[PDB]
Amino acid sequence: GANKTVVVTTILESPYVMMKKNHEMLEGNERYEGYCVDLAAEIAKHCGFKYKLTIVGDGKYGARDADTKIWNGMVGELVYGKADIAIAPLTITLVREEVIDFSKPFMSLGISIMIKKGTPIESAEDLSKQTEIAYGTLDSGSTKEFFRRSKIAVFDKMWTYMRSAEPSVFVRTTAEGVARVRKSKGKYAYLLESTMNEYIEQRKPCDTMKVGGNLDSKGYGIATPKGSSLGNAVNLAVLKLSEQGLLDKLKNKWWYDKGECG
């Protein structure tokens, strides 16, 4: 049939998607800026489709409710046919690949530790062997699922603590985790993806630090519903952009060219 506008689900997560200065004077895709906004435009141009960016209603990446088995977040938008494609920092995972399709990765990441500068923590093993400093993860994402499912001794011990900690150590948004690090005087550490950690480290007031090596090695992919006709073209577009160096330029544009800490 005739060409229709592709519905893109994404999420407000800096620097992937951010509200522009004066967004209240703008409409449609012009309201937004960031790495994934630029990436959407490049993918759409190579694949030759028009699109509308839509922020996921519940603000979640995507997890499956154990009881109802209903998917939420951006994953749910694809599963239930409310969006045609997700262009966001959406981590490739086994459970998600069982229900949606992912392109080859457009960016690498691993789980990492964010501390307030001066916190006497250097590693996940350090976190697991003490109780003075609390720590947690984002809700409804791949990081929380990583710890829930891990059989590695240190990570299993961390999950056993996190799942029962009171008050809750989990946060609903990355911004809430950053605020908790900054306001807890070194008594909270935040487990998040190295990409977001490195971005925040270069934003004012320059009071956080990434410590230790990454806990795993993964990537973000552009997601489509299973059997989608867009998957093949999107996949080739990602690989083309990668080999031309454009994904590297976009990373430098939105992370380091924008750095505020020197």
Ligand X SMILES: CN1CNS(=O)(=O)c2ccc(CCc3ccc4c(c3)N(C)CNS4(=O)=O)cc21
- Which residues contribute to the site for its own copies (CB under 8 A)? 92-94, 97-98, 102, 104-105, 108, 146, 149-152, 216-219, 235-236, 239-240, 242-245, 247-248
- Which positions from 115 through 144 interact with ligand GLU, judged by CB under 6 A? 138, 141-143
Q: Is 174 annotated as a binding residue?
A: no
Q: Is 143 annotated as a binding residue?
A: yes
CB of 97 to its own copies, least distance (A): 6
Partner from ligand X, Cl ion, its own copies, none binding residue 72, C-beta < 5-8 Å depending on class: Cl ion
Q: Is 193 annotated as a binding residue?
A: yes
105 binding ligand X? (CB under 6 A): yes
Q: Is 96 annotated as a binding residue?
A: yes
Write the binding mask 171 to 210 for ligand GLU: x where contact by CB under 6 A, - elsewhere: ---------------------xx-----------------
**Which stretches of the chain are assigned E, i.e. beta strand?**
6-10, 18-19, 32-33, 51-55, 85-86, 100-102, 107-109, 111-116, 134-136, 188-193, 208-211, 218-220, 223-225
Q: How many CB atoms within 10 Å of residue 183?
A: 10
Q: How far apart are CA 175 and CA 137, in angstroms?
A: 12
Q: How far apart are CA 204 and CA 202, in angstroms?
A: 7
- Among 107, 138, 191, 211, indicate the residue that binds ligand X (CB under 6 A): 107
- Among 58, 126, 198, 207, indicate the residue that binds Cl ion (CB under 5 A): 58
Q: How far apart are CA 14 and CA 174, in angstroms?
A: 9
CB of 21 to Cl ion, least distance (A): 5
CB of 22 to Cl ion, least distance (A): 5
Which two structure tokens, joined as six digits, stand for 27?
């409409």
Do 100 and 75 contact (CB within 8 A), yes or no? yes
Region for 3 from its dihedrals, namely left if φ exceeds 0, alpha if ψ lies in -120 to 50, beta otherwise: beta
Give Cα separations from 59 to 72, 74, 93 (angstroms): 9, 8, 19
Do 100 and 226 contact (CB within 8 A), yes or no? yes
- For the chain, how are helix, strand and coil distributed in percent, rounded to 5? 35, 20, 45
Q: Identify the residue whose tokens are 């046919």.
A: 81
Q: Contact region for ligand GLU (CB under 6 A) — 83-91, 150-158, 197-205, 251-259?
A: 83-91
CB of 194 to its own copies, least distance (A): 13
Q: Contact region for ligand X (CB under 6 A) — 30-38, 44-52, 100-108, 197-205?
A: 100-108
Partner from ligand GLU, Cl ion, ligand X, none binding residue 142, C-beta < 5-8 Å depending on class: ligand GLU
Nearer to ligand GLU, 35 or 49 (CB): 35
Binding footprint of Cl ion on the chain (CB under 5 A): 4-5, 21, 58, 72
Residue positions in the annotated binding site for L-glutamate?
89, 91, 96, 142-143, 193
